[PDB]
RNA sequence: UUUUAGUGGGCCAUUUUUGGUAAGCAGAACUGGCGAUGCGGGAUGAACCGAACGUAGAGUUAAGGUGCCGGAAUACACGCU
RNA sequence: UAUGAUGCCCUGACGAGUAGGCAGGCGUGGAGGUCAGUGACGAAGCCUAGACCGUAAGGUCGGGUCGAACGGCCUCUAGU
RNA sequence: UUGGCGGAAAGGCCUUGGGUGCUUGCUGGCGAAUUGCAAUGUCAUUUUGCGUGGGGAUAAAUCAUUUGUAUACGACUUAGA
């Protein structure tokens, strides 16, 4: 119910992430979905790895350049598997692919803001525990993905730039949960107590 | 004023335009039907063009009548538009093409006398 | 109040359709929620505006409105088929549209 | 590796100056007047 | 000797025509518009110097497997070419048009071309002769010219309709319950 | 075809509510109970609910009431018909045959 | 003659009505509706005041009052359809809210009357409404909803 | 009872069936289609599944489906991989 | 009296279709009758993202251009 | 206004200190009808242009000429107060 939703990409299904996300696309929800690279696919390894081998054998022959183009990055191949399920011709498919924006990492504009996950896409709640998964970024720097180190740099900087807050966080609450202490047996906390607050 | 008659239903009102009228200048407009054996408009596949036939007709009550609820009447002379002095508020005269500027004013100061409606009283007119 | 809003908001959807026909004479109202068809038959009959905006100015406004109304439920999740007195213009397919409280049943 | 500034010293001779310019002779020779201003001060915007 | 479609008052305008011109019309429709709505002085200069080879008329809707050149870069196209034959025909009828202005009496220093336009004439038949004793035809395509020049003027201000309102009784109703806020 | 035993209460709300008679064939509805005494009163029938014993009660007129009655349009079934496929057989989870006493429910879905 | 004339004119006689079978009948109120009731408006000029209900008028409206000297709405016809009876109730015994009908609004400032009938209905109104506790600033509030909010998880 | 048009090149499918290694091959039998036919389904596809068509509205359904494309359960239950 | 009996009205069922058959109408050039029809105060024709009627063939009108003849209806006819 | 932090798309975040406005924390008074039984009953954001007011600055590129490290033609590369 909010403007804009950040969907954390940490273990999330590619096709079931994917599937949810080009539906509320298709009924006008603005989704940016960050840190796309820590996303996860099933299956092992080797599996997926022959399954992109598979699609990159498949450029246009008379030129190869016109062909299907061969996207490495994993916000680029969550963009392909979500642009898949948005029919993505017509003029409709067009508008509800602006209304997505797909980051490696957690970017400027985007880490101040709260991170939602989905519940029937997360990797830990639908597999089996025991099955074998992907993490992309794994797979995409095996298919050349230049950059990875470079992500996890800045990351190894965000969190840090974030763990300082959650303390500068976190001890406030404490001061204002020690009020919520103090503000019990009064007359206001028994009439709400009353009235279910 | 007209007749109590029921709201005017009018099951299709688009034109039936034949098929490729538009793509060849040679073809009219004109409605003719594709008797060919390869048609897609006759053999009527799904978005083609829909083709008249008789269940488009119209309401036994409303058949012939305007918007204002009359059937128009050709009038050409004011003797011929004395046989609607006993039925006026269901026809409505209506002066032809050809009646010239200076008896189309004759015609409209007779209907006036006789309360006709004239669905046309601009006709050539000089201001 | 910083909220003024008496009209539960909702998202337009596609019209009526099969894989490969759509009847645009019925259209789709997902209304924010609701989750079952029972939940969503408190929404029967509840009259439907669309509200856009415009360029020229007609009988002194900018901002003109068709109006509709719910008919009936659709689907397990709530969706709702509601049509209008001039249907909706498939433009807006995922726009935002109101449904009032009146007629209130309450 | 996007590249986030440049800076260029103080008095540029009249070579690079004429790279700047399809037409050298028509033109004022005005290019780094206004940036070659940045010196008047001891270059804390430059040391920025 | 009717015209075109001119919007123009025609109490400021003199006009040129010069039908039957054996001219290509392909070229001079595209000296035509080369030449359209500007000042007729920068006209008289510009058609001057097409001559010259100084600029380029711009080919622009017959331009077909015309070799590209550096002069059109005026005029935002790569393919244009110098039709002189074209540009004399025209600018003897810009001439008369200036004479036809100053017998009008008008102002020489305001006048635009407002209106010009070729279209095509009867075509002048004859034939060539070519392989395996054949003959096919070899025909000019001559054209009418003609053109307006007008003079230009301001003070065309854009006062508009009263545009009455018919708003409801339930909206005036708002609308008057706003004069007894403030105003 | 899909039959069955019809019981008295489905008997009696498709001869009230589709009941239509053959008048010279003319398929006239049953609104009213002089249209059946003025055609079956040469057979003892003189209300509806003579025609509705003389069916459910196959008596000694049954030929001539039950071809007095219109066959029955019936609708298509209120609550679908409580299988994917229909033409399979009854017995295999389908919908065709005698199943005798369901076919009350069916008949009340298409009434 | 330009076209010719028809041998049969269909007749210029309109016709009798047939006897139609439709009694008026009165309205049967749901039972949310009672007066004294609090109510909530979806529309008009005073959407979302909350408001005292009075007497069900015989046009088959709802013959409210604000009361006027608390949110603003005078003693006024409502539609029964377009309100939201909220479940808190007043009690309206004392008040002459009998005199009025539908004869009483009429389509032609205030004509004076309606102000000396508004407070006298609204000072028996007050009197009863300072008898229960924060009720007199609740009448006051306006009504919306807020996000989060559903309307048929709501109760009222 | 008269009279007269158009055909006299056929094809497909289930079961029956001849020749043949077979065949989107050749040839018969009963029936149904396609030709002559639109529709919903089989992504598409003359004949397959449903179902046959005056024009509209509403309701219920068929065959097929209900992650997203696409209307509709990322429903429920037991297992297997 | 005051109107069509090849009419008006009631009831029911039904309505795919090539080759083909039949019926009911629309349109064109000419002939007889008729409207004591229209017409240089402007016919006929032509153009017209102007309007009305018929399910459709088609009809009717408004505007512009134009400059002499032409239309409805009951019938005949075909180089339709 | 005070200072610090943020370059992955910093353009935001926190903080020092006054001043001003409101306060529904609580208790008062007056107004708010006639939009006449509802009709989004218009109170958002974007882009542009015209005006007044104030601060700020006062160039280029193209053709034509010339070159040959380029050249089918454009393009390119040069040079010219």
């Given at each position: 119910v909010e403007p804009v939703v950040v969907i954390d990409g940490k273990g999330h299904l590619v096709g079931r992430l994917a599937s949810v996300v080009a539906k509320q696309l298709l009924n006008g929800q603005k989704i940016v979905v960050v840190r796309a690279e820590e996303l996860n696919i099933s299956g092992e390894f080797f599996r997926n790895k022959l399954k992109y081998h598979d699609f990159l054998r498949k450029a246009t022959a008379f030129n190869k350049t016109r062909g299907p183009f061969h996207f490495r990055a994993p916000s680029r191949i969550f963009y392909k598997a979500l642009r898949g399920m948005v029919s993505?011709?017509?003029?409709?498919?067009?508008?509800?692919?602006?209304?997505?924006?797909?980051?490696?990492?957690?970017?400027?504009?985007?880490?101040?803001?709260?991170?939602?996950?989905?519940?029937?896409?997360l990797r830990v709640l639908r597999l089996k525990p025991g099955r074998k998964y992907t993490?992309?970024?794994?797979?995409?720097?095996?298919?050349?993905?230049?950059?990875?180190?470079?992500?996890?740099?800045?990351?190894?900087?965000?969190?840090?730039?974030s763990a300082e807050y959650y303390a500068k966080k976190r001890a406030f609450t404490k001061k204002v949960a020690s009020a919520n202490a103090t503000a019990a047996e009064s007359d206001v906390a028994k009439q709400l107590a009353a009235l279910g607050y | 004023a007209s007749l109590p008659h029921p709201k005017i239903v009018?099951?299709?009102?688009?034109?039936?335009?034949?098929?490729?009228?538009?793509?060849?200048?040679?073809?009219?407009?004109?409605?003719?039907?594709?008797?060919?054996?390869?048609?897609?408009?006759?053999?009527?596949?799904?978005?083609?063009?829909?083709?008249?036939?008789?269940?488009?007709?119209?309401?036994?009550?409303?058949?012939?009548?305007?918007?204002?609820?009359?059937?128009?009447?050709?009038?050409?002379?004011?003797?011929?538009?004395?046989?609607?002095?006993?039925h006026t508020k269901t026809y409505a005269a209506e002066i032809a093409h050809n009646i010239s500027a200076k008896n189309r004013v004759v015609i409209l100061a007779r209907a006036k006398a006789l309360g006709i409606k004239v669905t046309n009283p601009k006709g050539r007119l000089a201001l | 109040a910083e909220s003024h809003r008496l009209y539960v908001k909702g998202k337009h959807l596609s019209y009526?359709?099969?894989?490969?026909?759509?009847?645009?004479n019925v259209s789709l109202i997902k209304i924010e929620g609701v989750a079952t068809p029972q939940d969503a038959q408190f929404y029967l009959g509840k009259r439907i505006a669309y509200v856009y905006r415009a360029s020229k100015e007609v009988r002194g406004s900018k901002i003109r409105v068709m109006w509709g109304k719910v008919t009936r439920t659709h689907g397990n999740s709530g969706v709702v088929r509601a049509t209008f007195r001039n249907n909706l213009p498939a433009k807006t397919f995922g726009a935002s549209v109101r449904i009032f409280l009146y007629p209130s049943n309450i | 590796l996007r590249s986030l500034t440049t800076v260029w010293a103080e008095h540029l001779s009249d070579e690079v100056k004429r790279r700047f310019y399809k037409n050298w002779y028509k033109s004022k020779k005005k290019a780094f007047t206004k940036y070659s201003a940045k010196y008047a001060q001891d270059g804390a915007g430059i040391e920025r | 000797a009717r015209y075109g479609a001119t919007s123009?008052?025609?109490?400021?305008?003199?006009?040129?025509?010069?039908?039957?011109?054996?001219?290509?019309?392909?070229?001079?429709?595209?000296?035509?518009?080369?030449?359209?709505?500007?000042?007729?002085?920068?006209a008289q200069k510009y058609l001057e110097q097409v001559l010259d080879h100084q600029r380029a008329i711009?080919?622009?809707?017959?331009?077909?497997?015309?070799?590209?050149?550096?002069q059109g870069k005026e005029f935002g196209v790569t393919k244009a070419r110098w039709p002189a034959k074209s540009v004399k025909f025209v600018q003897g009828l810009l001439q008369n048009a200036a004479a036809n202005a100053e017998a009008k009496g008008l102002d020489a220093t305001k006048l635009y071309v407002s209106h010009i336009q070729v279209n095509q004439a009867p075509k002048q038949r004859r034939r060539t002769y070519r392989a395996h004793g054949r003959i096919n035809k070899y025909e000019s395509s001559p054209s009418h010219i003609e053109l307006v020049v007008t003079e230009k003027e301001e003070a065309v201000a854009k006062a508009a309709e009263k545009k009455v309102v018919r708003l409801t009784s339930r909206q005036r109703g708002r609308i008057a319950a706003q004069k007894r806020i403030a105003a | 075809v899909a039959y069955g035993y019809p019981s008295y209460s489905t008997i009696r709300q498709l001869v009230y509510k589709r009941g239509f008679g053959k008048i010279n064939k003319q398929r006239v509805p049953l609104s009213?109970?002089?249209?059946?005494?003025?055609?079956?009163?040469?057979?003892?029938?003189?209300?509806?609910?003579?025609?509705?014993?003389?069916?459910?009660?196959?008596?000694?007129?049954?030929?001539?009431?039950?071809?007095?009655?219109?066959?029955?349009?019936?609708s298509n079934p209120s609550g679908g018909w409580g299988v994917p496929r229909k033409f399979k057989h009854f017995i295999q989870g389908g919908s065709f045959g005698n199943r005798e006493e369901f076919i009350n429910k069916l008949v009340k879905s298409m009434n | 003659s330009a076209q010719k004339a028809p041998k049969w004119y269909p007749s210029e006689d309109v016709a009798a009505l047939k006897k139609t079978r439709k009694a008026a009948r009165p309205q049967k109120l749901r039972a949310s509706l009672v007066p004294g009731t609090v109510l909530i408006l979806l529309a008009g000029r005073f959407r979302g005041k909350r408001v005292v209900y009075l007497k069900?008028?015989?046009?088959?409206?709802?013959?409210?009052?604000?009361?006027?000297?608390?949110?603003?709405?005078?003693?006024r016809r409502v539609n029964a359809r377009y309100v939201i009876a909220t479940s808190t109730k007043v009690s309206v015994e004392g008040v002459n809210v009998e005199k009025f009908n539908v004869e009483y609004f009429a389509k032609e400032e205030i004509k004076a009357e309606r102000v000396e009938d508004q407070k006298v209905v609204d000072k028996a109104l007050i009197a009863e409404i300072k008898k229960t506790p924060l009720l007199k600033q609740y009448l006051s509030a306006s009504f919306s909803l807020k996000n989060g909010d559903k309307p048929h998880m709501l109760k009222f």
């Amino acid at each position: 119910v909010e403007p804009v939703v950040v969907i954390d990409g940490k273990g999330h299904l590619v096709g079931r992430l994917a599937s949810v996300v080009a539906k509320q696309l298709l009924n006008g929800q603005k989704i940016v979905v960050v840190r796309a690279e820590e996303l996860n696919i099933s299956g092992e390894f080797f599996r997926n790895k022959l399954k992109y081998h598979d699609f990159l054998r498949k450029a246009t022959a008379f030129n190869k350049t016109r062909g299907p183009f061969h996207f490495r990055a994993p916000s680029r191949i969550f963009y392909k598997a979500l642009r898949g399920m948005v029919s993505h011709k017509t003029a409709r498919g067009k508008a509800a692919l602006e209304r997505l924006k797909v980051f490696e990492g957690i970017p400027p504009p985007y880490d101040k803001k709260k991170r939602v996950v989905v519940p029937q896409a997360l990797r830990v709640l639908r597999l089996k525990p025991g099955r074998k998964y992907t993490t992309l970024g794994k797979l995409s720097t095996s298919v050349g993905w230049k950059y990875e180190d470079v992500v996890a740099k800045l990351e190894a900087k965000r969190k840090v730039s974030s763990a300082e807050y959650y303390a500068k966080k976190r001890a406030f609450t404490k001061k204002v949960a020690s009020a919520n202490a103090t503000a019990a047996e009064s007359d206001v906390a028994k009439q709400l107590a009353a009235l279910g607050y | 004023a007209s007749l109590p008659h029921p709201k005017i239903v009018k099951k299709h009102t688009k034109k039936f335009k034949r098929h490729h009228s538009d793509r060849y200048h040679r073809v009219a407009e004109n409605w003719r039907k594709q008797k060919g054996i390869d048609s897609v408009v006759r053999r009527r596949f799904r978005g083609n063009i829909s083709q008249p036939k008789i269940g488009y007709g119209s309401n036994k009550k409303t058949k012939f009548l305007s918007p204002s609820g009359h059937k128009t009447f050709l009038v050409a002379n004011v003797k011929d538009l004395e046989t609607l002095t006993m039925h006026t508020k269901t026809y409505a005269a209506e002066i032809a093409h050809n009646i010239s500027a200076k008896n189309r004013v004759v015609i409209l100061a007779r209907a006036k006398a006789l309360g006709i409606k004239v669905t046309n009283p601009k006709g050539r007119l000089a201001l | 109040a910083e909220s003024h809003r008496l009209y539960v908001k909702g998202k337009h959807l596609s019209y009526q359709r099969s894989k490969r026909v759509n009847n645009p004479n019925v259209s789709l109202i997902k209304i924010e929620g609701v989750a079952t068809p029972q939940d969503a038959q408190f929404y029967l009959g509840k009259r439907i505006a669309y509200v856009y905006r415009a360029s020229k100015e007609v009988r002194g406004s900018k901002i003109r409105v068709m109006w509709g109304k719910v008919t009936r439920t659709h689907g397990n999740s709530g969706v709702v088929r509601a049509t209008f007195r001039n249907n909706l213009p498939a433009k807006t397919f995922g726009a935002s549209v109101r449904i009032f409280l009146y007629p209130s049943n309450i | 590796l996007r590249s986030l500034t440049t800076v260029w010293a103080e008095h540029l001779s009249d070579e690079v100056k004429r790279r700047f310019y399809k037409n050298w002779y028509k033109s004022k020779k005005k290019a780094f007047t206004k940036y070659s201003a940045k010196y008047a001060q001891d270059g804390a915007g430059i040391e920025r | 000797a009717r015209y075109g479609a001119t919007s123009t008052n025609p109490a400021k305008s003199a006009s040129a025509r010069g039908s039957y011109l054996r001219v290509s019309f392909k070229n001079t429709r595209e000296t035509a518009q080369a030449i359209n709505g500007w000042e007729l002085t920068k006209a008289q200069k510009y058609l001057e110097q097409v001559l010259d080879h100084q600029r380029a008329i711009p080919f622009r809707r017959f331009n077909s497997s015309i070799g590209r050149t550096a002069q059109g870069k005026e005029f935002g196209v790569t393919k244009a070419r110098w039709p002189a034959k074209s540009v004399k025909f025209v600018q003897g009828l810009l001439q008369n048009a200036a004479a036809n202005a100053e017998a009008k009496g008008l102002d020489a220093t305001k006048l635009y071309v407002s209106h010009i336009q070729v279209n095509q004439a009867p075509k002048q038949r004859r034939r060539t002769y070519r392989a395996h004793g054949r003959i096919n035809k070899y025909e000019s395509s001559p054209s009418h010219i003609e053109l307006v020049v007008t003079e230009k003027e301001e003070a065309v201000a854009k006062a508009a309709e009263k545009k009455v309102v018919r708003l409801t009784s339930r909206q005036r109703g708002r609308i008057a319950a706003q004069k007894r806020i403030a105003a | 075809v899909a039959y069955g035993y019809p019981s008295y209460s489905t008997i009696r709300q498709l001869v009230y509510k589709r009941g239509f008679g053959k008048i010279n064939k003319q398929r006239v509805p049953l609104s009213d109970n002089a249209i059946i005494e003025a055609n079956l009163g040469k057979y003892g029938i003189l209300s509806i609910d003579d025609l509705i014993h003389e069916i459910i009660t196959v008596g000694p007129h049954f030929k001539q009431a039950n071809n007095f009655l219109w066959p029955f349009k019936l609708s298509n079934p209120s609550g679908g018909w409580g299988v994917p496929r229909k033409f399979k057989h009854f017995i295999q989870g389908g919908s065709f045959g005698n199943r005798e006493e369901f076919i009350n429910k069916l008949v009340k879905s298409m009434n | 003659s330009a076209q010719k004339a028809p041998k049969w004119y269909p007749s210029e006689d309109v016709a009798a009505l047939k006897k139609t079978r439709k009694a008026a009948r009165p309205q049967k109120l749901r039972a949310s509706l009672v007066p004294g009731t609090v109510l909530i408006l979806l529309a008009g000029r005073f959407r979302g005041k909350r408001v005292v209900y009075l007497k069900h008028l015989e046009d088959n409206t709802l013959l409210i009052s604000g009361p006027f000297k608390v949110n603003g709405v005078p003693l006024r016809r409502v539609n029964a359809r377009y309100v939201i009876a909220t479940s808190t109730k007043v009690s309206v015994e004392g008040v002459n809210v009998e005199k009025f009908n539908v004869e009483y609004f009429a389509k032609e400032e205030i004509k004076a009357e309606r102000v000396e009938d508004q407070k006298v209905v609204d000072k028996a109104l007050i009197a009863e409404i300072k008898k229960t506790p924060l009720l007199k600033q609740y009448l006051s509030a306006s009504f919306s909803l807020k996000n989060g909010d559903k309307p048929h998880m709501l109760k009222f």
